[PDB]
Amino acid sequence: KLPPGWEKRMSRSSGRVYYFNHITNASQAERPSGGKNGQGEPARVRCSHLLVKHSQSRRPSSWRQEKITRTKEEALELINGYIQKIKSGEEDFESLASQFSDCSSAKARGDLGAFSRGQMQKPFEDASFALRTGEMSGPVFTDSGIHIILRTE
Incomplete structure (x- = not known):
């Protein structure tokens, strides 16, 4: 589950649950997806x-x-x-x-x-x-x- 690079995380010394992408360094409160397989990445x-x-x-x-x-x-x-x-x-x-x-x-x-x-x-x-x-x-x-x-x- 979760597209490439995403992982549910939480803030230190805090309790906020957010989703982080290790490749894009992006953060957001919304789950990055709700199936498609072997899709890969855009050429x-x-x-x-x-x-x-x-x-x-x-x-x-x-x-x-x-x-x-x-x-x-x-x-x-x-x-x-x-x-x-x-x-x-x-x-x-x-x-x-x-x-x-x-x-x-x-x-x-x-x-x-x-x-x-x-x-x-x-x-x-x-x-x-x-x-x-x-x-x-x-x-x-x-x-x-x-x-x-x-x-x-």
Whole structure:
């Protein structure tokens, strides 16, 4: 049971029961499924993303600032904030991606087009193919920094 990467978990020092995906780092209160077998994964997918660079990205620079100085910690803080804000319904992925993504793909509301495996940085790729159409990732780390991924196709 439960699609690839999912497992029921619980918060430490707390009792909240939630479902976590080890591949996408995504969290949610709703059970990820309610049968299909040998389905596998998509041969190709289309995703959008929001990148938050920190002082340790392979390129600590973006169209937002010539020199990124924030730390990973601070970058993760910014990420969780955007996710929380997206999940609450106070903001939409597209608008936050266009405003605060350090990836030049911001001009296209964070849209990266379609790609297959072997095209994106491994950790990014792995999350992308573990997502189902319409699902958003949790904090995903790469050399570029930390991302939030939304699969659209």
